[PDB]
Amino acid sequence: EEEKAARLLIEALEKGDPELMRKVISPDTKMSINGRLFTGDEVVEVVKEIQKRGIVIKLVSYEKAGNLWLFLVTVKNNGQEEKVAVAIVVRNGRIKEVIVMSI
Amino acid sequence: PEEEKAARLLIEALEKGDPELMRKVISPDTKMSINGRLFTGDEVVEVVKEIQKRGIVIKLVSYEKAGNLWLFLVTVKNNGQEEKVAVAIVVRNGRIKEVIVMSI
Ligand SMILES: [Zn+2]
Ligand SMILES: [Zn+2]
Ligand SMILES: [Zn+2]
Ligand SMILES: [Zn+2]
Ligand SMILES: [Zn+2]
Ligand SMILES: [Zn+2]
């Protein structure tokens, strides 16, 4: 169920299907994206905005410790490329906390 | 507020790895993945000790937080080579429950 949620996140991101995230986000999910805080449905709306903008995300690598996952992705928009770290904590099959940080 | 206290302690542990502070914040059930290699409990303390013993210099670049999840970006210097490393930590009840260390 832990692994399910992480796997669904990757699939959702690859597919550009933000709505699929609703299967792993909860109303109490907290996200920090470069210091900006979002909760619950707002997290889905942020991911939707990212997809709407056509931002291209490629997974580079990932690691896991217990219910904690850390992903390194490359992000491309308008020919500019950046590395981003995405940390998630899963509880009861749901992503409860997420940090997105530009490197 | 209480965040600043916790941040200060976490940063000190990450940069300097004081053994006595490590023993206070690691529990027998703490799980660490360091570039895919898994360590648990006391082992985590021993790994931090080894990193410090080798003279690896760790400096905070930035960090973020959401609930009990923290993410630190550090520079690591060893033998004239410099790299960026991401450290993700989950805290529960004043202790580190999970930590991932990943070279970028
Ligand atoms: Zn699309
Ligand atoms: Zn909405
Ligand atoms: Zn827009
Ligand atoms: Zn110290
Ligand atoms: Zn002492
Ligand atoms: Zn030992």
mmCIF file of all heavy atoms in Angstrom, chain A residues 30-32 34-35 37 61-70 72 83 85 87 89 91 97-99 101 103, chain B residues 31 33 35-36 38 62-71 73 86 88-90 92 97-100 102 104:
data_model
loop_
_atom_site.group_PDB
_atom_site.id
_atom_site.type_symbol
_atom_site.label_atom_id
_atom_site.label_comp_id
_atom_site.label_asym_id
_atom_site.label_seq_id
_atom_site.Cartn_x
_atom_site.Cartn_y
_atom_site.Cartn_z
ATOM 1 N N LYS A 30 -0.082 17.614 3.046
ATOM 2 C CA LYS A 30 0.643 18.868 3.060
ATOM 3 C C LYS A 30 1.784 18.813 2.063
ATOM 4 O O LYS A 30 2.565 17.853 2.052
ATOM 5 C CB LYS A 30 1.234 19.177 4.437
ATOM 6 C CG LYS A 30 0.261 19.092 5.604
ATOM 7 C CD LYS A 30 0.922 19.555 6.901
ATOM 8 C CE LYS A 30 0.609 18.713 8.127
ATOM 9 N NZ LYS A 30 -0.656 19.089 8.716
ATOM 10 N N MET A 31 1.896 19.884 1.274
ATOM 11 C CA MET A 31 2.978 20.015 0.314
ATOM 12 C C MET A 31 3.695 21.328 0.555
ATOM 13 O O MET A 31 3.069 22.367 0.795
ATOM 14 C CB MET A 31 2.475 19.968 -1.130
ATOM 15 C CG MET A 31 3.572 20.201 -2.153
ATOM 16 S SD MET A 31 3.195 19.751 -3.848
ATOM 17 C CE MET A 31 2.111 21.080 -4.113
ATOM 18 N N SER A 32 5.029 21.264 0.448
ATOM 19 C CA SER A 32 5.843 22.456 0.319
ATOM 20 C C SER A 32 6.524 22.363 -1.043
ATOM 21 O O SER A 32 7.241 21.390 -1.298
ATOM 22 C CB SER A 32 6.889 22.522 1.416
ATOM 23 O OG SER A 32 7.692 23.674 1.193
ATOM 24 N N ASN A 34 9.086 24.560 -3.085
ATOM 25 C CA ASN A 34 10.020 25.651 -2.914
ATOM 26 C C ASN A 34 9.552 26.661 -1.878
ATOM 27 O O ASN A 34 9.537 27.865 -2.154
ATOM 28 C CB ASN A 34 10.291 26.346 -4.276
ATOM 29 C CG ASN A 34 11.102 25.467 -5.185
ATOM 30 O OD1 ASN A 34 12.092 24.806 -4.755
ATOM 31 N ND2 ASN A 34 10.707 25.425 -6.427
ATOM 32 N N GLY A 35 9.158 26.136 -0.712
ATOM 33 C CA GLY A 35 8.746 26.944 0.419
ATOM 34 C C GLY A 35 7.286 27.413 0.418
ATOM 35 O O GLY A 35 6.832 27.982 1.402
ATOM 36 N N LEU A 37 3.380 26.618 0.634
ATOM 37 C CA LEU A 37 2.587 25.564 1.246
ATOM 38 C C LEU A 37 1.211 25.421 0.612
ATOM 39 O O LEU A 37 0.534 26.414 0.310
ATOM 40 C CB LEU A 37 2.415 25.823 2.761
ATOM 41 C CG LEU A 37 3.694 26.064 3.526
ATOM 42 C CD1 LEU A 37 3.440 26.241 5.060
ATOM 43 C CD2 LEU A 37 4.708 24.922 3.319
ATOM 44 N N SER A 61 16.145 8.988 -10.568
ATOM 45 C CA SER A 61 16.410 7.921 -9.620
ATOM 46 C C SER A 61 15.547 8.112 -8.391
ATOM 47 O O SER A 61 14.936 9.162 -8.198
ATOM 48 C CB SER A 61 17.895 7.871 -9.240
ATOM 49 O OG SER A 61 18.274 9.113 -8.702
ATOM 50 N N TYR A 62 15.495 7.081 -7.559
ATOM 51 C CA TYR A 62 14.686 7.186 -6.361
ATOM 52 C C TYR A 62 15.186 6.166 -5.354
ATOM 53 O O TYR A 62 15.844 5.191 -5.717
ATOM 54 C CB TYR A 62 13.164 6.996 -6.598
ATOM 55 C CG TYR A 62 12.790 5.599 -7.046
ATOM 56 C CD1 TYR A 62 12.548 4.587 -6.130
ATOM 57 C CD2 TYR A 62 12.689 5.291 -8.396
ATOM 58 C CE1 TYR A 62 12.213 3.299 -6.552
ATOM 59 C CE2 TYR A 62 12.357 4.016 -8.827
ATOM 60 C CZ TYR A 62 12.118 3.021 -7.905
ATOM 61 O OH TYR A 62 11.779 1.779 -8.383
ATOM 62 N N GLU A 63 14.893 6.469 -4.088
ATOM 63 C CA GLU A 63 15.262 5.621 -2.969
ATOM 64 C C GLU A 63 14.098 5.642 -1.981
ATOM 65 O O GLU A 63 13.192 6.465 -2.063
ATOM 66 C CB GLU A 63 16.555 6.089 -2.316
ATOM 67 C CG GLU A 63 17.785 6.069 -3.235
ATOM 68 C CD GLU A 63 18.234 4.720 -3.787
ATOM 69 O OE1 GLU A 63 17.697 3.663 -3.374
ATOM 70 O OE2 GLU A 63 19.122 4.729 -4.668
ATOM 71 N N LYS A 64 14.126 4.671 -1.069
ATOM 72 C CA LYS A 64 13.073 4.461 -0.105
ATOM 73 C C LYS A 64 13.696 4.055 1.225
ATOM 74 O O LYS A 64 14.636 3.267 1.248
ATOM 75 C CB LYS A 64 12.160 3.386 -0.655
ATOM 76 C CG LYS A 64 10.993 2.957 0.251
ATOM 77 C CD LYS A 64 10.416 1.599 -0.199
ATOM 78 C CE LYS A 64 9.173 1.247 0.564
ATOM 79 N NZ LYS A 64 9.512 0.752 1.919
ATOM 80 N N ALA A 65 13.152 4.591 2.309
ATOM 81 C CA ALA A 65 13.472 4.133 3.653
ATOM 82 C C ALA A 65 12.169 4.082 4.441
ATOM 83 O O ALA A 65 11.597 5.133 4.730
ATOM 84 C CB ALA A 65 14.420 5.104 4.287
ATOM 85 N N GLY A 66 11.708 2.883 4.793
ATOM 86 C CA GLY A 66 10.411 2.776 5.474
ATOM 87 C C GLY A 66 9.311 3.342 4.573
ATOM 88 O O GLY A 66 9.291 3.025 3.377
ATOM 89 N N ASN A 67 8.492 4.254 5.118
ATOM 90 C CA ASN A 67 7.421 4.908 4.356
ATOM 91 C C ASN A 67 7.815 6.238 3.718
ATOM 92 O O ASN A 67 6.985 6.998 3.236
ATOM 93 C CB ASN A 67 6.165 5.052 5.230
ATOM 94 C CG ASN A 67 6.293 5.965 6.441
ATOM 95 O OD1 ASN A 67 7.359 6.158 7.014
ATOM 96 N ND2 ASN A 67 5.149 6.594 6.848
ATOM 97 N N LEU A 68 9.126 6.466 3.624
ATOM 98 C CA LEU A 68 9.678 7.697 3.069
ATOM 99 C C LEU A 68 10.268 7.349 1.712
ATOM 100 O O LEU A 68 10.981 6.349 1.587
ATOM 101 C CB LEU A 68 10.739 8.291 3.982
ATOM 102 C CG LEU A 68 11.598 9.413 3.399
ATOM 103 C CD1 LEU A 68 10.805 10.634 3.124
ATOM 104 C CD2 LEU A 68 12.701 9.780 4.405
ATOM 105 N N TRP A 69 9.902 8.151 0.695
ATOM 106 C CA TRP A 69 10.492 8.006 -0.618
ATOM 107 C C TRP A 69 11.153 9.314 -1.016
ATOM 108 O O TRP A 69 10.635 10.378 -0.713
ATOM 109 C CB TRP A 69 9.505 7.571 -1.711
ATOM 110 C CG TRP A 69 8.765 6.309 -1.409
ATOM 111 C CD1 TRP A 69 7.895 6.071 -0.356
ATOM 112 C CD2 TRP A 69 8.822 5.109 -2.155
ATOM 113 N NE1 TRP A 69 7.451 4.791 -0.404
ATOM 114 C CE2 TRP A 69 7.998 4.167 -1.506
ATOM 115 C CE3 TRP A 69 9.516 4.711 -3.292
ATOM 116 C CZ2 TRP A 69 7.786 2.898 -2.008
ATOM 117 C CZ3 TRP A 69 9.313 3.436 -3.779
ATOM 118 C CH2 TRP A 69 8.485 2.537 -3.124
ATOM 119 N N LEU A 70 12.248 9.218 -1.791
ATOM 120 C CA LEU A 70 12.879 10.394 -2.348
ATOM 121 C C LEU A 70 13.153 10.138 -3.827
ATOM 122 O O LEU A 70 13.793 9.167 -4.180
ATOM 123 C CB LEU A 70 14.169 10.717 -1.566
ATOM 124 C CG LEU A 70 14.953 11.936 -2.064
ATOM 125 C CD1 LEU A 70 14.098 13.230 -1.911
ATOM 126 C CD2 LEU A 70 16.294 12.035 -1.365
ATOM 127 N N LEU A 72 14.558 11.891 -7.518
ATOM 128 C CA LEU A 72 15.255 12.932 -8.245
ATOM 129 C C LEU A 72 14.725 12.917 -9.670
ATOM 130 O O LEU A 72 14.751 11.867 -10.314
ATOM 131 C CB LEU A 72 16.743 12.697 -8.225
ATOM 132 C CG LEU A 72 17.564 13.704 -9.037
ATOM 133 C CD1 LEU A 72 17.567 15.075 -8.391
ATOM 134 C CD2 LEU A 72 18.987 13.169 -9.305
ATOM 135 N N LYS A 83 17.081 20.265 -12.051
ATOM 136 C CA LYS A 83 16.935 19.082 -11.230
ATOM 137 C C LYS A 83 16.045 19.458 -10.065
ATOM 138 O O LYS A 83 16.178 20.547 -9.523
ATOM 139 C CB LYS A 83 18.282 18.574 -10.732
ATOM 140 C CG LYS A 83 19.267 18.192 -11.824
ATOM 141 C CD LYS A 83 20.585 17.655 -11.192
ATOM 142 C CE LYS A 83 21.578 17.160 -12.192
ATOM 143 N NZ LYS A 83 22.110 18.281 -12.990
ATOM 144 N N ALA A 85 14.159 17.654 -6.450
ATOM 145 C CA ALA A 85 13.993 16.578 -5.502
ATOM 146 C C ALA A 85 12.558 16.571 -5.002
ATOM 147 O O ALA A 85 12.000 17.620 -4.695
ATOM 148 C CB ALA A 85 14.962 16.702 -4.322
ATOM 149 N N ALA A 87 10.299 14.579 -2.116
ATOM 150 C CA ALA A 87 10.190 13.656 -1.005
ATOM 151 C C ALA A 87 8.703 13.440 -0.697
ATOM 152 O O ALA A 87 7.931 14.404 -0.676
ATOM 153 C CB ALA A 87 10.918 14.181 0.254
ATOM 154 N N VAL A 89 5.977 11.114 2.089
ATOM 155 C CA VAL A 89 5.729 10.210 3.183
ATOM 156 C C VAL A 89 4.352 9.630 2.969
ATOM 157 O O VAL A 89 3.384 10.374 2.810
ATOM 158 C CB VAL A 89 5.803 10.906 4.585
ATOM 159 C CG1 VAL A 89 5.490 9.936 5.684
ATOM 160 C CG2 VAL A 89 7.141 11.572 4.800
ATOM 161 N N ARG A 91 1.264 7.119 4.369
ATOM 162 C CA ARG A 91 0.642 6.488 5.515
ATOM 163 C C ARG A 91 -0.736 5.986 5.086
ATOM 164 O O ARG A 91 -1.489 6.727 4.458
ATOM 165 C CB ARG A 91 0.476 7.482 6.670
ATOM 166 C CG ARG A 91 1.775 7.903 7.330
ATOM 167 C CD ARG A 91 1.483 8.431 8.767
ATOM 168 N NE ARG A 91 0.819 9.738 8.786
ATOM 169 C CZ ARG A 91 1.394 10.894 8.458
ATOM 170 N NH1 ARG A 91 2.699 10.989 8.242
ATOM 171 N NH2 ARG A 91 0.641 11.981 8.351
ATOM 172 N N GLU A 97 2.567 13.820 3.233
ATOM 173 C CA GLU A 97 3.455 14.980 3.179
ATOM 174 C C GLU A 97 4.319 14.858 1.942
ATOM 175 O O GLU A 97 4.720 13.751 1.600
ATOM 176 C CB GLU A 97 4.378 15.023 4.456
ATOM 177 C CG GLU A 97 3.620 15.462 5.678
ATOM 178 C CD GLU A 97 3.786 14.598 6.898
ATOM 179 O OE1 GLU A 97 3.766 13.360 6.697
ATOM 180 O OE2 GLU A 97 3.851 15.132 8.039
ATOM 181 N N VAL A 98 4.617 16.004 1.326
ATOM 182 C CA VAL A 98 5.394 16.058 0.110
ATOM 183 C C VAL A 98 6.218 17.334 0.137
ATOM 184 O O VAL A 98 5.703 18.412 0.469
ATOM 185 C CB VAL A 98 4.519 16.138 -1.141
ATOM 186 C CG1 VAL A 98 5.402 16.190 -2.390
ATOM 187 C CG2 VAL A 98 3.490 15.075 -1.184
ATOM 188 N N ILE A 99 7.491 17.209 -0.235
ATOM 189 C CA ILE A 99 8.329 18.377 -0.470
ATOM 190 C C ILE A 99 8.816 18.302 -1.909
ATOM 191 O O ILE A 99 9.299 17.254 -2.342
ATOM 192 C CB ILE A 99 9.498 18.484 0.514
ATOM 193 C CG1 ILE A 99 8.975 18.694 1.915
ATOM 194 C CG2 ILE A 99 10.487 19.613 0.118
ATOM 195 C CD1 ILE A 99 10.125 18.671 2.974
ATOM 196 N N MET A 101 11.542 20.374 -4.199
ATOM 197 C CA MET A 101 12.586 21.359 -4.074
ATOM 198 C C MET A 101 13.481 21.405 -5.302
ATOM 199 O O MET A 101 14.095 20.413 -5.665
ATOM 200 C CB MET A 101 13.406 21.031 -2.783
ATOM 201 C CG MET A 101 14.644 21.822 -2.642
ATOM 202 S SD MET A 101 15.684 21.366 -1.171
ATOM 203 C CE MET A 101 14.556 21.422 -0.069
ATOM 204 N N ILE A 103 16.804 22.190 -7.278
ATOM 205 C CA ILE A 103 18.224 22.151 -6.969
ATOM 206 C C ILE A 103 18.927 23.118 -7.914
ATOM 207 O O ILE A 103 19.410 24.149 -7.459
ATOM 208 C CB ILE A 103 18.725 20.708 -7.044
ATOM 209 C CG1 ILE A 103 18.030 19.881 -5.971
ATOM 210 C CG2 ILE A 103 20.267 20.609 -6.935
ATOM 211 C CD1 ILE A 103 17.975 18.520 -6.296
ATOM 212 N N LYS B 31 15.349 3.971 10.186
ATOM 213 C CA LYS B 31 15.762 3.391 8.926
ATOM 214 C C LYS B 31 16.428 4.460 8.067
ATOM 215 O O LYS B 31 15.894 5.566 7.910
ATOM 216 C CB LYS B 31 14.603 2.796 8.145
ATOM 217 C CG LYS B 31 13.903 1.659 8.859
ATOM 218 C CD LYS B 31 12.595 1.282 8.177
ATOM 219 C CE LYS B 31 11.855 0.193 8.896
ATOM 220 N NZ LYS B 31 10.523 -0.027 8.267
ATOM 221 N N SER B 33 18.452 5.001 4.236
ATOM 222 C CA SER B 33 18.955 4.594 2.946
ATOM 223 C C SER B 33 19.980 5.638 2.518
ATOM 224 O O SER B 33 19.659 6.816 2.448
ATOM 225 C CB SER B 33 17.861 4.516 1.895
ATOM 226 O OG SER B 33 18.424 4.148 0.657
ATOM 227 N N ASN B 35 22.397 6.284 -0.576
ATOM 228 C CA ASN B 35 22.610 5.841 -1.949
ATOM 229 C C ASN B 35 22.261 4.373 -2.140
ATOM 230 O O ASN B 35 23.061 3.615 -2.676
ATOM 231 C CB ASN B 35 24.062 6.142 -2.371
ATOM 232 C CG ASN B 35 24.252 7.652 -2.589
ATOM 233 O OD1 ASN B 35 23.389 8.365 -3.194
ATOM 234 N ND2 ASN B 35 25.338 8.182 -2.094
ATOM 235 N N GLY B 36 21.041 4.021 -1.705
ATOM 236 C CA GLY B 36 20.476 2.701 -1.879
ATOM 237 C C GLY B 36 20.891 1.638 -0.859
ATOM 238 O O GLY B 36 20.354 0.540 -0.878
ATOM 239 N N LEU B 38 20.977 0.200 2.909
ATOM 240 C CA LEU B 38 20.114 0.336 4.074
ATOM 241 C C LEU B 38 20.845 0.079 5.384
ATOM 242 O O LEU B 38 21.638 -0.858 5.517
ATOM 243 C CB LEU B 38 18.907 -0.652 3.970
ATOM 244 C CG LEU B 38 18.142 -0.578 2.642
ATOM 245 C CD1 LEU B 38 16.997 -1.648 2.568
ATOM 246 C CD2 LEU B 38 17.617 0.806 2.424
ATOM 247 N N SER B 62 20.163 24.679 1.606
ATOM 248 C CA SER B 62 18.807 25.128 1.885
ATOM 249 C C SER B 62 17.985 23.986 2.456
ATOM 250 O O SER B 62 18.427 22.827 2.446
ATOM 251 C CB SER B 62 18.154 25.690 0.624
ATOM 252 O OG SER B 62 18.139 24.672 -0.358
ATOM 253 N N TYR B 63 16.802 24.301 2.992
ATOM 254 C CA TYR B 63 15.943 23.216 3.429
ATOM 255 C C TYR B 63 14.481 23.632 3.322
ATOM 256 O O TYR B 63 14.183 24.816 3.263
ATOM 257 C CB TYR B 63 16.289 22.755 4.843
ATOM 258 C CG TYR B 63 15.761 23.635 5.950
ATOM 259 C CD1 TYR B 63 14.548 23.362 6.552
ATOM 260 C CD2 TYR B 63 16.445 24.773 6.358
ATOM 261 C CE1 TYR B 63 14.014 24.194 7.523
ATOM 262 C CE2 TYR B 63 15.939 25.595 7.368
ATOM 263 C CZ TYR B 63 14.723 25.287 7.958
ATOM 264 O OH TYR B 63 14.140 26.035 8.954
ATOM 265 N N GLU B 64 13.612 22.624 3.329
ATOM 266 C CA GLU B 64 12.170 22.844 3.351
ATOM 267 C C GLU B 64 11.537 21.818 4.290
ATOM 268 O O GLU B 64 12.191 20.865 4.727
ATOM 269 C CB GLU B 64 11.608 22.707 1.906
ATOM 270 C CG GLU B 64 12.156 23.702 0.907
ATOM 271 C CD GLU B 64 11.906 25.189 1.162
ATOM 272 O OE1 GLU B 64 11.125 25.542 2.084
ATOM 273 O OE2 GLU B 64 12.542 26.000 0.446
ATOM 274 N N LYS B 65 10.256 22.043 4.586
ATOM 275 C CA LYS B 65 9.562 21.286 5.599
ATOM 276 C C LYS B 65 8.085 21.239 5.243
ATOM 277 O O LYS B 65 7.515 22.250 4.857
ATOM 278 C CB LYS B 65 9.755 21.944 6.986
ATOM 279 C CG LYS B 65 9.174 21.181 8.133
ATOM 280 C CD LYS B 65 9.363 21.923 9.459
ATOM 281 C CE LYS B 65 8.707 21.233 10.644
ATOM 282 N NZ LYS B 65 7.231 21.255 10.573
ATOM 283 N N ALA B 66 7.467 20.063 5.406
ATOM 284 C CA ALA B 66 6.023 19.928 5.344
ATOM 285 C C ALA B 66 5.601 18.923 6.404
ATOM 286 O O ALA B 66 5.923 17.731 6.302
ATOM 287 C CB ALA B 66 5.581 19.428 3.957
ATOM 288 N N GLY B 67 4.885 19.406 7.422
ATOM 289 C CA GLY B 67 4.581 18.586 8.586
ATOM 290 C C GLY B 67 5.866 18.080 9.213
ATOM 291 O O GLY B 67 6.795 18.858 9.388
ATOM 292 N N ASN B 68 5.944 16.761 9.440
ATOM 293 C CA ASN B 68 7.108 16.124 10.034
ATOM 294 C C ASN B 68 8.154 15.662 9.034
ATOM 295 O O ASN B 68 9.121 15.007 9.413
ATOM 296 C CB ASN B 68 6.615 14.926 10.917
ATOM 297 C CG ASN B 68 6.008 15.478 12.214
ATOM 298 O OD1 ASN B 68 4.953 15.088 12.709
ATOM 299 N ND2 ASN B 68 6.662 16.456 12.775
ATOM 300 N N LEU B 69 7.962 16.038 7.758
ATOM 301 C CA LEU B 69 8.919 15.754 6.709
ATOM 302 C C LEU B 69 9.814 16.966 6.470
ATOM 303 O O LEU B 69 9.347 18.094 6.333
ATOM 304 C CB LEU B 69 8.138 15.400 5.425
ATOM 305 C CG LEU B 69 8.982 15.240 4.164
ATOM 306 C CD1 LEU B 69 9.982 14.078 4.268
ATOM 307 C CD2 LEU B 69 8.103 15.065 2.962
ATOM 308 N N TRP B 70 11.104 16.714 6.385
ATOM 309 C CA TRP B 70 12.110 17.737 6.129
ATOM 310 C C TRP B 70 12.949 17.298 4.937
ATOM 311 O O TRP B 70 13.195 16.102 4.736
ATOM 312 C CB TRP B 70 13.059 17.903 7.313
ATOM 313 C CG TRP B 70 12.450 18.270 8.604
ATOM 314 C CD1 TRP B 70 11.638 17.502 9.363
ATOM 315 C CD2 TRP B 70 12.633 19.499 9.316
ATOM 316 N NE1 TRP B 70 11.309 18.164 10.523
ATOM 317 C CE2 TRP B 70 11.914 19.397 10.517
ATOM 318 C CE3 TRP B 70 13.352 20.666 9.062
ATOM 319 C CZ2 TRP B 70 11.869 20.428 11.443
ATOM 320 C CZ3 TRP B 70 13.300 21.698 9.988
ATOM 321 C CH2 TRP B 70 12.575 21.574 11.150
ATOM 322 N N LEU B 71 13.453 18.275 4.189
ATOM 323 C CA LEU B 71 14.347 17.993 3.089
ATOM 324 C C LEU B 71 15.454 19.027 3.137
ATOM 325 O O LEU B 71 15.191 20.211 3.057
ATOM 326 C CB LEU B 71 13.614 18.015 1.722
ATOM 327 C CG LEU B 71 14.448 17.681 0.519
ATOM 328 C CD1 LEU B 71 15.053 16.338 0.560
ATOM 329 C CD2 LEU B 71 13.589 17.745 -0.751
ATOM 330 N N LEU B 73 19.239 20.270 1.486
ATOM 331 C CA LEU B 73 20.183 20.197 0.396
ATOM 332 C C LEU B 73 21.513 20.661 0.974
ATOM 333 O O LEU B 73 21.585 21.756 1.529
ATOM 334 C CB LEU B 73 19.730 21.041 -0.792
ATOM 335 C CG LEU B 73 20.716 21.110 -1.917
ATOM 336 C CD1 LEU B 73 20.779 19.797 -2.670
ATOM 337 C CD2 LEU B 73 20.365 22.244 -2.884
ATOM 338 N N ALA B 86 21.051 15.376 -1.245
ATOM 339 C CA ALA B 86 19.729 15.622 -0.692
ATOM 340 C C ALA B 86 19.529 14.667 0.475
ATOM 341 O O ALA B 86 19.823 13.484 0.373
ATOM 342 C CB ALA B 86 18.648 15.442 -1.730
ATOM 343 N N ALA B 88 16.535 13.606 3.099
ATOM 344 C CA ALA B 88 15.134 13.646 3.516
ATOM 345 C C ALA B 88 14.988 12.945 4.852
ATOM 346 O O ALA B 88 15.582 11.894 5.059
ATOM 347 C CB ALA B 88 14.257 12.991 2.480
ATOM 348 N N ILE B 89 14.250 13.566 5.776
ATOM 349 C CA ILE B 89 14.124 13.065 7.139
ATOM 350 C C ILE B 89 12.661 13.153 7.563
ATOM 351 O O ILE B 89 11.987 14.145 7.279
ATOM 352 C CB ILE B 89 15.008 13.890 8.091
ATOM 353 C CG1 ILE B 89 16.516 13.725 7.784
ATOM 354 C CG2 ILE B 89 14.715 13.557 9.513
ATOM 355 C CD1 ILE B 89 17.440 14.761 8.532
ATOM 356 N N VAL B 90 12.186 12.110 8.241
ATOM 357 C CA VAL B 90 10.910 12.118 8.921
ATOM 358 C C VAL B 90 11.206 12.063 10.417
ATOM 359 O O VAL B 90 11.934 11.185 10.886
ATOM 360 C CB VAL B 90 10.009 10.965 8.479
ATOM 361 C CG1 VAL B 90 8.726 10.898 9.284
ATOM 362 C CG2 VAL B 90 9.741 11.034 7.015
ATOM 363 N N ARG B 92 9.505 11.792 14.248
ATOM 364 C CA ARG B 92 8.340 11.500 15.076
ATOM 365 C C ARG B 92 8.797 11.513 16.535
ATOM 366 O O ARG B 92 9.790 10.865 16.876
ATOM 367 C CB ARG B 92 7.709 10.129 14.746
ATOM 368 C CG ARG B 92 7.401 9.838 13.251
ATOM 369 C CD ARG B 92 6.168 10.520 12.573
ATOM 370 N NE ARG B 92 5.667 9.675 11.491
ATOM 371 C CZ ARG B 92 5.394 10.065 10.248
ATOM 372 N NH1 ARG B 92 5.336 11.348 9.917
ATOM 373 N NH2 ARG B 92 5.104 9.139 9.333
ATOM 374 N N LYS B 97 12.824 8.990 12.414
ATOM 375 C CA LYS B 97 12.270 7.685 12.093
ATOM 376 C C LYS B 97 12.795 7.097 10.779
ATOM 377 O O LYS B 97 13.011 5.888 10.705
ATOM 378 C CB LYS B 97 10.726 7.786 12.114
ATOM 379 C CG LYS B 97 10.016 6.756 11.269
ATOM 380 C CD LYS B 97 8.503 6.679 11.492
ATOM 381 C CE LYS B 97 7.830 5.868 10.399
ATOM 382 N NZ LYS B 97 6.369 5.788 10.579
ATOM 383 N N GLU B 98 13.003 7.960 9.776
ATOM 384 C CA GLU B 98 13.439 7.555 8.446
ATOM 385 C C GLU B 98 14.331 8.661 7.904
ATOM 386 O O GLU B 98 14.053 9.848 8.112
ATOM 387 C CB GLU B 98 12.235 7.358 7.480
ATOM 388 C CG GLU B 98 11.451 6.131 7.817
ATOM 389 C CD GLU B 98 9.974 6.258 7.754
ATOM 390 O OE1 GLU B 98 9.419 7.353 7.457
ATOM 391 O OE2 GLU B 98 9.346 5.194 7.946
ATOM 392 N N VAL B 99 15.374 8.272 7.169
ATOM 393 C CA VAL B 99 16.287 9.209 6.533
ATOM 394 C C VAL B 99 16.729 8.610 5.201
ATOM 395 O O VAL B 99 17.038 7.427 5.110
ATOM 396 C CB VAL B 99 17.455 9.663 7.472
ATOM 397 C CG1 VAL B 99 18.073 8.500 8.225
ATOM 398 C CG2 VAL B 99 18.509 10.507 6.694
ATOM 399 N N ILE B 100 16.696 9.423 4.142
ATOM 400 C CA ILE B 100 17.304 9.058 2.876
ATOM 401 C C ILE B 100 18.386 10.074 2.550
ATOM 402 O O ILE B 100 18.164 11.281 2.630
ATOM 403 C CB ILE B 100 16.288 8.990 1.737
ATOM 404 C CG1 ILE B 100 15.161 7.954 2.056
ATOM 405 C CG2 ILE B 100 16.981 8.718 0.357
ATOM 406 C CD1 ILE B 100 14.131 7.930 0.959
ATOM 407 N N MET B 102 20.864 11.001 -0.613
ATOM 408 C CA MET B 102 21.044 10.716 -2.022
ATOM 409 C C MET B 102 21.945 11.753 -2.681
ATOM 410 O O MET B 102 21.635 12.959 -2.693
ATOM 411 C CB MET B 102 19.647 10.686 -2.689
ATOM 412 C CG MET B 102 19.673 10.639 -4.155
ATOM 413 S SD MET B 102 17.937 10.839 -4.732
ATOM 414 C CE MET B 102 17.186 9.486 -3.790
ATOM 415 N N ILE B 104 23.390 13.808 -5.703
ATOM 416 C CA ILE B 104 22.753 14.370 -6.878
ATOM 417 C C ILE B 104 23.808 14.323 -7.990
ATOM 418 O O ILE B 104 24.869 14.906 -7.808
ATOM 419 C CB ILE B 104 22.275 15.788 -6.614
ATOM 420 C CG1 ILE B 104 21.308 15.899 -5.424
ATOM 421 C CG2 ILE B 104 21.694 16.411 -7.897
ATOM 422 C CD1 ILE B 104 20.066 15.079 -5.514
#
